[model samples]
Target: TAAQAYVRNVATAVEAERDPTTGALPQLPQACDQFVANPPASVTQCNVTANNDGVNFTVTAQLTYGSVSFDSSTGQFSFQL
Candidate 1:
């Protein structure tokens, strides 16, 4: 859960930095730096006894450049610029 929360925080920062009118990525590098400086503590241990019964998690982060947005969904990126 901690990891998920951290990623969500990063996403929020990214979105803020990409404010449509800003036309800049001011908080982009800061968000990445913060993640590296303060790693999230683990929330729970996975059950190794069952592969299908383990905890599931997902992270969806985006970065914007100019008018384009790079989505970290689908393990790929999409851009309009």
Candidate 2:
């Protein structure tokens, strides 16, 4: 679930980062393509974190394999998957 959560959080962050005027988020496909072009040493250890005080409103999402962690920085909803 961590991996899934990671993907979801990243996707959400990317979506939120999109320019309202242009309707464009960070180029995920391009990032994945480039990452795959020179694949890392291990995908199993992949980690993702999203922090956006402006759009996300103090929400930070951290994800890894089998676990998902959400930190609000206000001592709310911090736990494991």
Candidate 3:
């Protein structure tokens, strides 16, 4: 249904963004307008870095989903959702 699509959009923008102030993904709200009430969660963080092993590796790692609270006061998005 539309729910799945919305989540897909969230993920798309979530992964697309590479920077944030406090883990809040900027794309969530833009694509989430359809929901009026944003989802229970939003992309929190994303990081890409070179290998720290000293050999030859790049570990782009970070946590996503509910990492950034878009609208906490209104409950527009959350991890519990």
Candidate 4:
């Protein structure tokens, strides 16, 4: 659905342009411009986090009905329901 795609895109964007100092992605409303018109359910509750181990990092997002994650070291997206 739209919600799933929205979450994935947001996570991907944040991962791509992550902050240099902190490996934290935008929480909400920062990378939400894309879904401003067609917002999804539980959008506010969506959470994105990154775990950086000095050199490599991983991005994870908790959505309404599933999980969207990315592994920087492997450069792949792992989707779980």
lDDT (Cα, tens digit) per residue for candidate 2, span 1-81: 433444345444555566799654343323322222322332243332334543332223333223333342342334444
Q: Candidate 3's residue-wise lDDT over 1-81, tens digit each?
A: 233334444444443453555543332323343223354332233222223332221111123422322222232433332
Tens digit per residue, CA lDDT, model 4, 4-46: 5665565556566656688644443243443234446644444
List CA RMSD, all candidates.
15.9, 8.9, 13.6, 5.3
Q: Quote model 3's TM-score.
A: 0.26
Per-residue alpha-carbon lDDT of candidate 1 for residues 1-81, written as tens digits (9 for 90 to 100): 444444555445444544477444333233343432353444221110111312211233332232222233332323322
Q: Against the true structure, whose TM-score is highest? A: 4
The lDDT for every candidate, in the order shown, is 0.34, 0.38, 0.32, 0.53
TM-score of each: 0.35, 0.35, 0.26, 0.42
lDDT of predicted model 1:
0.34
lDDT of 4 at 72: 56
Best by lDDT: 4
lDDT of 3 at 27: 28
| Candidate 4 local lDDT, residue 76 | 71
* Residue pairs in candidate 2 whose N, alpha carbon or C atoms collide under 3 angstroms: none
Please state the error at residue 62 of candidate 3 in Å: 23
